[PDB]
Structures are given as structure tokens and as C-alpha cells.
Amino acid sequence: IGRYLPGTTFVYRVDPRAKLLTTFYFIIMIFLANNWVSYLVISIFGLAYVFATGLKARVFWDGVKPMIWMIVFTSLLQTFFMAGGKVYWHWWIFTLSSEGLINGLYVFIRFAMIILVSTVMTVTTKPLEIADAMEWMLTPLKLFKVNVGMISLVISIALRFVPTLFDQTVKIMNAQRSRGADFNDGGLVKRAKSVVPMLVPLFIDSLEVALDLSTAMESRGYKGSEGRTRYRILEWSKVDLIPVAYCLLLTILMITTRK
Amino acid sequence: YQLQRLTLLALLTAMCVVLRIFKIIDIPNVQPVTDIIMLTTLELGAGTGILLAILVMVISNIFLGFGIWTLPQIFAYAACALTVALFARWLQELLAGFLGLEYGFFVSLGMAGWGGWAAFIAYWVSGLTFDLYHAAGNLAFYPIFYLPLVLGDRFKKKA
Amino acid sequence: GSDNIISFDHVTFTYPDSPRPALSDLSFAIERGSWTALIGHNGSGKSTVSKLINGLLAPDDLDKSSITVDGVKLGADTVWEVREKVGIVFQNPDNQFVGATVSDDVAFGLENRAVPRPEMLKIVAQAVADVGMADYADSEPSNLSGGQKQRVAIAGILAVKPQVIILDESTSMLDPEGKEQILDLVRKIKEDNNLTVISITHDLEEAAGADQVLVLDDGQLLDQGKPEEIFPKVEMLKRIGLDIPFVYRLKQLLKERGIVLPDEIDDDEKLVQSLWQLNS
Amino acid sequence: MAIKFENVSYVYSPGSPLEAIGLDQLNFSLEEGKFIALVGHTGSGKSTLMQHFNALLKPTSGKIEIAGYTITPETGNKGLKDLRRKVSLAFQFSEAQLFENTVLKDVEYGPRNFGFSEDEAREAALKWLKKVGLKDDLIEHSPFDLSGGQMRRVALAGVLAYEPEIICLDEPAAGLDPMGRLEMMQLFKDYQAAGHTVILVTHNMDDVADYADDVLALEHGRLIKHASPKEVFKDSEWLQKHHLAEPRSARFAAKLEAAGLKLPGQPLTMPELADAIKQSLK
């Protein structure tokens, strides 16, 4: 862990599987963009929650600060009042009036909303609960070359170790200061063998420990699929119909102008 | 029978996630991606879909959180693993078809065009970024790959 | 009676065959119900004794000297049904920790065995409660204090309901008063569940607490007897290279400092009551 | 060669004098040629204070007055290959700093990066492969095809291969069996007494009895007392109130005194617990 936070004790924001069905709908939904029951709605009916998270307003400059030459840089390539490239339909480019200013500011919502509804994915959920929802839709992939139950080990285990690694990937950097060390020393075609005291012990603990992690997996009952019950599951509650209506109301509140 | 090849892709893929996390105290990442290291060690005698489910086991499992590392916000997961779905299927032309057409022609050419239009705009504002990828990212095959990376890479496995 | 025959067994590593055999000897047996220490110099090939026992290792052969139990043998297509007779804790619990809770890794061993999750909630609570781990319920193990991952890991056996517990160099990286908390967590199970916990090199209470002891160099054994029969051989143990428990490392600092009580005195409750037998 | 704190505090995230956790009140005065301890119960200040001394962390209230140099809260990264040639902390399981392809190049990595040619650092990389406990096979080779006692001699020579003024030690023969930790530790009496300020992070009570001359004790994030072995385990409410323990040479007098023997004292050592089972059974 892991940004941002299951902060106490905010409103529902629960069932980390139905806020994945949600966060992807709310991009697989906000396609088909024509009209006003879409933007003024999605920009506030798909935001009615994101704000309801209420978490401070200075968070989103983490998602915008250190690279600003995309957003009002490439949406401006959309600012032609008619198919902002390679227009192509029809006959007037730049405008300041009722119709060139909307189409091109109408993307300052429909596109900067899916970076909020996604922030509030990695904001409200437990990274051991962002993970279980990735796998919930996953293991039903048993039609194809199935291979699905070996990737759902990895995820408890990939994440079992992102702390054990960074917690030792590091001590090797402080242990290699009784010996050295050279870390920040520039040089394009001069110096890159700064990171050697650290990556050389780190590959042991990918390669060795996965031998000594896999032999105690193996030597319990891990014959490994078939068989193989599981323990990590969560329930749904009467609570969690909120994002299941969130996206149903926005079925009719999507077509209700196309009708 | 000859497994323990997956239970390593939980722990190799804990260390490409925890290498682009930088060991952020003294941050040996200078400039762009420095995780591709062990990821030719995987061509060298390991597998094809071993190379693919190590980056979709990263650009998923370190997409939390926040997420997107290079660019601003939310895209580029396994358009970053089209670079890696064709990997193995020298050091000089590992970052030069990559540099030239492979790396970013899927990452933002997807992102910065959806109606069927132009893409170079945000695509190569990263110009020198994508030619600064390969300063010591070519010269990273010299120190750590051939002797250290892929030698021991053998002595552990194949038991 | 006896629970394992390891006959004139032997292990050879991949390239070190003609240079350095791992056992070549040993030629031992263990008692079905006892706490067995195995001691020896740190190359004696002994930290592998416990991998031959569950089929992690088919080292040399399986026919000339095989391993056997009084149920099953190593190793056929049953070799998996000898990971239901046995159960082993290991060296560094940080690694063999499969599951970022406590209850996930205790019940990864009923996962793989068709055992219903309602019956796993329960097999796993009083396996993670029998070790004190109800209040550290779902603690991630990259966070956990190194002491407690060795108690999350003697649960994993109770969840799978063995016949045999085994210690493969366990509580060596652990603090001096980290091990004596965990190593009584295992003598309780030898009371609470009267199983048989097969220990490897340490000293006094991993050695002279125990009911037996075996001293091995360089792969070969003398003195299978009780720790009390064994450590008295203090010299062709300093050429073996070892120590003796502070039980015995004071009786010699008492036979040198005057107090020459007989040389079979093992209990910490034999250096207490045998030594006010002398104030007179 | 006289190490003092007055006064040091380190909490990861900002604020002073708030609050208590991590390392609080941290005050003492050490001595040059002594055997220092860093003891207690786990979770107080040992590993968390070890890392300050040689500036691998810098305080947030005061100063580390030290052997030569001096650590302040605003400190930087100038003059650290003599500092870190004067102080060389040894962390817990340091056979993990290993990266080279000869051993000797790990033990050459101590003298180099601190200012020596290859062929002088071949006389510290060879002196510290021989005077650290390894035989005519292992005064140079590949650095992994060893054992962890032999790689903890690369670990503890690569960090000793410049003869640092001060050598802290975060339980640096941890994991080692009977004979391994009883050779690396007396080693540290010949190279402590060289005038050399030997610190030791541990919880082996029967090593302060054995090897120490002074002590330094903590609890809960607050220093309970800087000591020396005999002002330490007299009152066993200081082991009961303050979380600690005693050596089994000291833990047993009370197991012998509680019979009517009443040994002459609280001796705590093995050759001197048994001169007192004598001078009292007379």
C-alpha cells in the first residue's frame, strides 16, 4: 500500500468488484456522445459519487501536475467546431460562438471524468481488493486456453512481496554504504553501473526465493489445479445495488434524447 | 511436471513492479523505463507467454496505485505489451525497432487518436523522452544482463 | 514404535557428485512419538534429511535404500499422500507465505485437498487461534514481525491435520527469545495433539531439551542416542566441531570449579536440586 | 573517538517535539575503545537508532557528535567516504550486499570507494579474507559458491576492509550456528581493543556478559538507561517492567539461590557463575 486510501468512515464505496463493473461501464457508457442529457448529466451524474467521496480538492493535481502538455494541448486539436481533425467536414475551423466553443470544451468533461472515476478506483479500494475484482471477472476465462488459476495465485503473491521487496531492495542500498556507494552519478555514455550493488542481490530474491517459496507451496497439497478450493472471498450486501442502478439509470439517461 | 516456473512470475513480477517503483529512497531511476532488464533474461531460455504475463502482471499490479507512470493518466497497459508480445517472436536493435516504430506507436497512437485522425501531437512531445530511453538502456545490456542476469537465471531452475 | 527408517541413505547434488557427497551414510531411525534433534557441522548434509521425507528430493534412488513409514513410502504416485502424513515448517517463513493474511496461508493446505470452505473457516481459526493469531487476523506478511510468521506457519500443518511435524532449520534467523516462544508452541502440539516433531541443528533446547540427538560429519553419523548420551562426547565433537548445552557447559565449569556431580544430569531441574544437595 | 548524542530524535514524518515514537530522548556519552550494546526488546530503538550514527539517517532535534565528523538535522552528502570509512554499521543478514564475481572484489569494494588502488586494496581485500576466518581455498574466489558463514565473512570483511574507527553491528552473526557466531565475536575483541569503538545491536543477553564493557538500552521508543553490564540486571523488575531478559548464567543464580544456596552475587557469566557455586557450597 499504496495510494490512496480506505479512509474512515466514508459513504458506501464498497464491493470492490462492482466499482470495476462501474468504472469501466462509465467509459463503455460515455461512448456514444451526441447530446445534452449526456454531458451535463455524466459530468454531474457520473460525478455525483466521485465528489461524494468528498476527499480534499488538492488530490487531483497529483493526476495533472507534472505533465500539462496533453490536456489543453491535444483537446485543442479538437477545437475546430467540426471534426477537429483532419477536418474533413465541413467548412469552418475556429469559432467563439454557441457551437464551436461547446465541441472542444465538451471534452473537458467527457474525458477528464474517466480520470476521476478511475482515481476513485485507486482511492477508495484496498489494493488487496482492487486485486480480487480483477480476478473475479477473470477466472471465468475457462473457455479458452484456460490457464486462469495460476494468475490468481500470482496476485496474492505479486502483492505479498511488493512490500517485502521495497523493504529489502532498500536495505541493500543502505547495506551497500558500508561498502560504497555510487548512486546519483550522471553520465549518459559514462555512468549507469550505480545500481549494481542492489540489482545483483535483488535477482537472487526473485530467482532463489521462488524456489524456496514454490517448495512449501508444493509440499502441502499443492498438486495445483485440479482440486484446489479457495479462501479469499467477500459477500455482497443489500447495500451494493447503488452502482448497479448508477449505470442502469444512465441507460435511459443515455438514450432518453435518442429515445 | 516441470513447474515452479509460475511461482517465480509472482516473484520476478514482484521485482519489475518494485523496480519501477524505484526503491524510492535514493531512486536509481534517473529517466524513463528501467524494468526491461530481466525481460530479455526471459527470452533467453524461458518463454513467450512468460514475457507477456510479466508486464500485464505489472501494468496491472502496479497500476494500483496511483497508476500510469510515464504519461499523465489512465491508458497504456498491454499496448505497452505489444512491445513484449513480439519480443523473441543484439543489444543494438532491442532499443532501435523499439525506439523507432515499436515502443510508442501503440502507446499514444492509440491514446491520441480515436475518431481515426492524427496522433503525433502528444505522441512525440515525448520525442527526446523516447530517444532518452536508450542512453544506458542499450548500455544496460552490457553490465547486468549477459553475465549476471542470465547466468544465474539457469542455475536456479530446470531442477 | 519407530516412525521412520532412513537406512544407509545418501544425497548427491547435481554437479557435486564425485567431489562432495551429501550423506553417503546414515543409517538411522527415529521413534514414532519422539522429539528428534539432528546436529552436525554445517556441511554435513543434514538440512536435507527432511526433504527426502516428503518427495521434495528423489536424490540418488528409491529402491536400494528408500524411505518408508508404517503407512506409505517414498516415492511412487503416492509421494503426494506422504505430504498428508508429514508436515514441515521451514527456515524463513517470509517466503513460503502464500497469502497476504493469516487465514489465507493456513487454509491454502485445505484448498488443494477438496475440503469445504465452511469447514475451512473453522479448521483455520482454531489453527490460527491455537497459535494466538486471532487478534492478528488478516495481517499482511511483508508487514508481519518475523517472529509471528513462524506461528502462522505451524498453523498451516494443523489446518491440514498431519501425522508428523518437522523442523527444517526453523528459528535460526529468529531472536534468542523469539525461538523459545515458538519452540514451546510445538511441544504443546506434542501434548495437545501428540504428534512427532523432527528437529534440526541448534543447541541446548533444540538439542538437550529433545528426546534424541544425532551428530553427523561430513554426512555420516555417530551417537544416535539421547542428547544426554551424545554431548558428553565433548571432544570428538570439537573435531566434529560442536558445542554442548549450558547444562553440560557448566558441569565442566563445575568439574573444573570443584563440583563433580555425576555425568548424567540433563534437566534444568537436575542442576537445581542436585546443587543444593551440596551446600550441606 | 567519543560518541555522544545531545539530543537526537527521528520520526519519519514531520513535527517536533512530537511525538514519542521511533527514537526519543536518545542521550548518552560513549567511550573510544569500548564494547557498546544496543539491546532491549524488539521495537524500541536498535535498528532504528543504529542507522543514524554514520549518517545513513540524520536527526530532527539535535546532533550526533561523533568520531571526527558530526551529524546535524540539516546535513548533506559531502565528506562521507571518510565518515563512512570511520563508521561502518553492519546490518541484519549482511550476506545480502553481495554482487561481485570474485569475492575479493566485494572485500575490495570497502577499501575502494574509500580511496585505494587495486593493489593496496588487494592487501586489505586479502588481509580481510585471511584475518576474518577463511582458508587457503577462500582467500579469493567466486562469491556465492560459499556458505552463509563464509559469505557473512565477505559481508563482514567487505564492511571491515577499511578498518573503520567504529563498527556498529545489527546482529551480524545472526542465523549462525554454535561455532560460527563464537568465532566472529571474539574476532571483535581483538579489533575492538585496537582502539576501536565496537557497537552491537542485539538481544543476546549472554553476550553483554561475555563481550561487553558498556551497554545502551531502550524500550517502546524511549531510552530507558545507558548502562554497563552490572548496573543492568540486578533488579529483575527492570526486566519485568522494562521489556528485557537476562543471561542463562545470570538467570540461574536465582534458580540456585532459590534453594538456600544463595550464590555470592549476580554473576551473569559462565566461568564466573561457577566460581560462585563453589565459594558457597564450601
Author numbering:
A (entry chain D): 6 to 264
B (entry chain A): 7 to 95, 106 to 175
C (entry chain B): 1 to 280
D (entry chain C): 1 to 282
Please share text taken word for word from the publication where this structure appeared:
ECF-transporters are multi-subunit membrane complexes that consist of two ATPases, similar to the ATPases of ABC transporters, and two membrane embedded proteins, not related to any other protein family. The two ATPases and one of the transmembrane proteins, EcfT, form the ‘energizing unit’ or ’ ECF-module’. The other membrane protein, termed S-component, acts as the substrate-binding protein and dynamically associates with the ECF-module to allow for substrate translocation. We demonstrate that ECF-CbrT is a Cbl transporter that catalyses ATP-dependent uptake of Cbl and its precursor Cbi.
We crystallized the ECF-CbrT complex in detergent (n-Dodecyl-β-D-maltopyranoside, DDM) solution and solved a crystal structure to 3.4 Å resolution using molecular replacement with the structure of the folate transporter, ECF-FolT2, from L. delbrueckii as a search model. There are two copies of ECF-CbrT in the asymmetric unit, corresponding to molecules A and B, each of them comprising CbrT, EcfT, EcfA and EcfA’. In both complexes, the two nucleotide-binding domains (NBDs; EcfA and EcfA’) are in a nucleotide-free state, adopting an open conformation with two incomplete ATP-binding sites. CbrT is in a ‘toppled’ orientation in the ECF-CbrT complex with TMs 1, 2, 3 and 4 oriented almost parallel to the membrane plane. Although OH-Cbl was added in excess to the crystallization condition, the substrate was not bound. The apo-state of the toppled S-component was observed before in other ECF-type transporters and likely represents the inward-facing state after substrate release. We hypothesize that the binding site for Cbl is located in a large cavity observed in the CbrT structure. In contrast to ECF-FolT2, and structurally characterized ECF complexes from other organisms, the binding cavity in ECF-CbrT is largely occluded, and not accessible from the cytosol. The occlusion is caused mainly by the position of loop 3, which obstructs access to the cavity in CbrT. We speculate that occlusion of the empty binding site after cytoplasmic release of the substrate may be required for the subsequent reorientation of the S-component, upon release from the ECF module.
